[PDB]
Write a protein that binds this DNA or RNA. Structure first.
Ligand code: NA
Length: 108
DNA sequence: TAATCCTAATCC
DNA sequence: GGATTAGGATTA
């Protein structure tokens, strides 16, 4: 019976742009964090969109691999630049570096 | 076809 | 950042 607040709407829009896939745990987390029902979160995501893995292109992979080899530390500015030039969100760039570091640690 | 490999994305 | 799963492609 209550409208989403400005902060609730803004957060939902950010979440959906970052990742439109709602797992059970993510629906529960967002429900708790936002103070909205799971049904409300689920309906809002379904309306907006009416395990998704990105297929990183050869061009995206070549750039990420080169950037990691040049510098393993990812500044916010470079994260933003790579998000812009590669068409990936900042979280995806951060996770790519994290996964690549973990793969290296698993080897040597 | 089924085993096996790579790694993006989740959950913590 | 650690642990692990899961898309999905490759290999045998
Ligand atoms: Na990744």
């Amino acid at each position: 019976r209550t409208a989403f607040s400005s902060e609730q709407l803004a957060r939902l829009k950010r979440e959906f742009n970052e990742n439109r896939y709602l797992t059970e745990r993510r629906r529960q987390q967002l429900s708790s964090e936002l103070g909205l029902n799971e049904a409300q979160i689920k309906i809002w995501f379904k309306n907006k969109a009416a395990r998704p893995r990105t297929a990183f292109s050869s061009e995206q992979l070549a750039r990420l691999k080169r950037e990691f080899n040049e510098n393993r530390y990812l500044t916010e500015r470079r994260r933003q630049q790579l998000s812009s030039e590669l068409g990936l969100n900042e979280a995806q760039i951060k996770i790519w570096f994290k996964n690549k570091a973990a793969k290296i640690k698993k080897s040597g």
